[PDB]
Amino acid sequence: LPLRLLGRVALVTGGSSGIGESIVLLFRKHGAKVCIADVQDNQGQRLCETLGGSSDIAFCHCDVTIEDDVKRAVDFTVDKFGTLDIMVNNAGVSGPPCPDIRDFELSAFDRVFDINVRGVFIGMKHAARIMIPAKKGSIISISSVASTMGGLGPHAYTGSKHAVLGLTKNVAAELGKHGIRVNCVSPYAVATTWDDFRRFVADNANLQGVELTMEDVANAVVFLASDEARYVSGMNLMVDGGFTSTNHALQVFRP
Amino acid sequence: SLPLRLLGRVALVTGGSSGIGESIVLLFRKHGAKVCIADVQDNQGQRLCETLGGSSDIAFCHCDVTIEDDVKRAVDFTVDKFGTLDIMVNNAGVSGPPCPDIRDFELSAFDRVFDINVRGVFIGMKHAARIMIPAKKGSIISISSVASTMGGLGPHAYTGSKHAVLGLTKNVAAELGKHGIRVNCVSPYAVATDTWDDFRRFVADNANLQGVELTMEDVANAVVFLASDEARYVSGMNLMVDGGFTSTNHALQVFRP
Amino acid sequence: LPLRLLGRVALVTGGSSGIGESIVLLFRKHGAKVCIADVQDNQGQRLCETLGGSSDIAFCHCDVTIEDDVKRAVDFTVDKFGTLDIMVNNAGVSGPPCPDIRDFELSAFDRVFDINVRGVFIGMKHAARIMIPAKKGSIISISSVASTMGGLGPHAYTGSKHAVLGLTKNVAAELGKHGIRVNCVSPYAVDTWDDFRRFVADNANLQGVELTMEDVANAVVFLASDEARYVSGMNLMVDGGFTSTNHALQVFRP
Amino acid sequence: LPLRLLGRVALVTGGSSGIGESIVLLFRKHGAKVCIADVQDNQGQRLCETLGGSSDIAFCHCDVTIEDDVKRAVDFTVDKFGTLDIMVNNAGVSGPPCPDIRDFELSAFDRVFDINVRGVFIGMKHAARIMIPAKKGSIISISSVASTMGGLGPHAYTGSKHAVLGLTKNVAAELGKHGIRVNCVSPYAVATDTWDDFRRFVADNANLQGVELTMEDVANAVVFLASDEARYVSGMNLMVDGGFTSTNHALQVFRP
């Protein structure tokens, strides 16, 4: 059986660390060619040194809040590997916790929407510039459980994660007529006072007995990137173990 | 007979000079409320100001909802006129030009829509909260649209912002529930605010509910409901006024020819 | 200002007690003529004696699990008051708590779907028989928060409440072409009396107010009136934000 | 790289034909052992002769509307292959089209809920009897787009598909504490005079153009939720509708 992504070209924004690093590593294992677009042009190569000088991985410096940067990333990728088949919008931030809305600064608010929403739309816009004439492609954005439910995070974070789902569904509507799939992946809180946050998210988890790892989220992306999701679009794939579809506040099934 | 449904309540309406906001203001006033309009362009702001008359239970404050200090002055003005703030209506909203190809969507156009639709709504929540939290009572209502739940019903920036408003509504409802404050949003179907007849026929043909046309007063009635004590335990709700448009899909012609 | 439901005829299934009793009382305050369809004539009229022997309220005995019973209710209401404008499907049960699915009896399962789903569909079907030629009407079903989220109740209950939402949306699709509105109302939970009262309030999103039966009734009155003349396919939550939020991570609640 | 389901035991209700046949064939390609539970034991083995002879596939006659039948299916599978790791509830019917609710017979209504809802719950109940002491497993039900949107099918069908989603979420809540994943897969209409014309019709109203929804596409979704790549996926309605339910092209914003 061939590798699930053999020959496909992928661009991953924020791939230098965190979930993006997992996605990049998993994509390579399944035969993909991957370009990382991330800030701090030193660190993206610094990660690239760790994984080696493979001729199927490349780094482009890109601030996803600048349209011309993301443009240069896509133009760079198609010049290395000849096309662009997968676009992963992983750049995302949360903002500081704010327990009282009366202390929520609009500057903090503005920054989160600039990165979480504007950055994702720019990625869709320039991936579309390649994928539409090819009549094929797969666009994947990393949302979180805050895309479907309130109270799971700060206001600007929750609003932006909802906005990403709305963009996903609307752009899925426009790009469906060209064969382009748009989807988003919404994870539960992932660890990495360490075992204290690790215990907390596990105690409030619906699914007990396994910990949500970064590789779990990556596996969801790999699915939506491959031809096994060939007819999947406009979908918010939850990797929350059932956290959002349930509520154990009345203690019907949990003590 | 029975008392008026909003008697003695103070309301602030952003964008009340025209359109749906004008209906909300007029309906609120019919049910006994005191209303302050916050709207831009004092030329249009005075335009309605004279239009309604000179009553001592209506007032106008000039406010660009994209400026936090403007909305701050609106709230501070209202509580100085009528003594408190019980209802906050975020009706300022824009759609943007139609754009059929994402490859031609300008980020400046994108930025403007989110500034007004999302940032303006959050600022309204933030400063209404500054009054309503110490009173331990209030009702915040935002005017979304059917684009808050379904894709393809409008441009990208519009659909994203309407989704963002629903997300803010639910999240702020989570924070303000502790204090007895209700946060909800109202999502209308397209309203026809010779080409008028042509758009009017188009939205009616694609409507789920036939034999009636969505008027501005219909949307206002939904707000009046969520503003009153008949919605005393309603919060976090996206009250659709779409006649079933979003909950159904007649593309397979099971029930429509 | 006139009463919000003046001259309107309403049928309420399960209106002898609980939420249905409040819906009936509220409907009458707003000028409606109301027919109650409920079991146990010995009690169905006995409560109808406490309200009084008015000429704008009537009782018909009806097992909502029997199609011919619901049929006679609608035929009775129309013969009393001349038409049928509002149909309220309030008959609903939950079943015993079952903490382990391996002990869930299928007979218990069958009974809940018979009353909660089959009873609601029969109500829609025979209300439709009147409302379609009139080209007007409003059908309202009483769901609960279990219509949108799992874990808030037993399996058969949660499944049936989801089924009611699905029927509501699908029948809204068919009856929209005739001007008929279909909606559903999903309430939050309303010495064990007092200790249940504190428990639902502690886990409530909206604090400082308790969900009363009159609150749910007000939602129905809204969807029954012309103030909702363009509302259809809607699941109106009266849960104070309970289903749209989750305080398990203690972001906003301690 | 090993096969994605190597050593896992799966029970598939309705596996003789349609989507279930593809799920069985795909599961087998990825190393799984499969038991088919389907009515009409005549045809039920006829497929088991169609696919071929194998010591990793088996057939049990089972009416999913009878609890004791499904019970015997699970007890049969565990005795053949030693455990039960995957349970697929594919048995499902739709009922005749009914354009006017005033002509909808309650007998027709009763039959659809008996098979679509009661059959699915029985499958969950008896899969749970095995999977809870093992502290592992994956339960997958085949819903359709009618689980999320009205108007896409008859009333009894749409109600039952909604009920299945509700059961999925609620049972996911109870079985999460044991490590058991419950999910459902909701496909768009699959084609396989009125063949090429129903096929041309669902494609015109599809959001995603240039690709036809095949049965193998739906099977791939199940394989995903059956494997350890969905190890933390539960309570999920995985749409395979190409974006059909998340969009609405009635206003012709993006489609002419």
Residue numbers in the entry:
A (entry chain B): 13 to 204, 220 to 282
B (entry chain D): 12 to 204, 219 to 282
C (entry chain C): 13 to 202, 219 to 282
D (entry chain A): 13 to 204, 219 to 282
Give sentences copied directly from the paper behind this entry.
BDHs belong to the family of short-chain dehydrogenase–reductases. The members of this enzyme class have a TGXXX(AG)XG NAD+-binding motif and a YXXXK active-site motif and form dimers or tetramers. Some BDHs have a high twofold stereoselectivity in the conversion of chiral monoterpenoids by preferring one of the two substrate enantiomers and forming a stereocenter by asymmetric reduction of the diastereotopic keto group. Here, we report the determination of the structures of two stereoselective dehydrogenases, SrBDH1 and SoBDH2, by single-particle cryoEM.
We produced SoBDH2 with an N-terminal His6 tag (theoretical molecular mass 32.2 kDa) in E. coli and prepared the protein at high purity. Size-exclusion chromatography coupled to multi-angle light scattering (SEC-MALS) revealed two distinct species corresponding to an octameric and a tetrameric assembly. From the 1 551 724 particle images that were initially picked, 173 781 particle images were selected by iterative 2D and 3D classification cycles for homogeneous 3D refinement. Although we had observed a fraction of octamers in solution, 3D refinement only yielded a tetrameric structure; we also failed to detect octamers in negative-stain EM. After the application of global and local CTF refinement, particle-based local motion correction and NU refinement within the cryoSPARC framework, a final gold-standard resolution of 2.04 Å was obtained. The protomers adopt a Rossmann-like fold as required for binding of the NAD+ cofactor. Loss of the cofactor could not be prevented by adding a threefold molar excess of NAD+ to SoBDH2 before size-exclusion chromatography. The quality of the density allowed the modeling of 50 double conformations of amino-acid side chains and the localization of 268 water molecules.
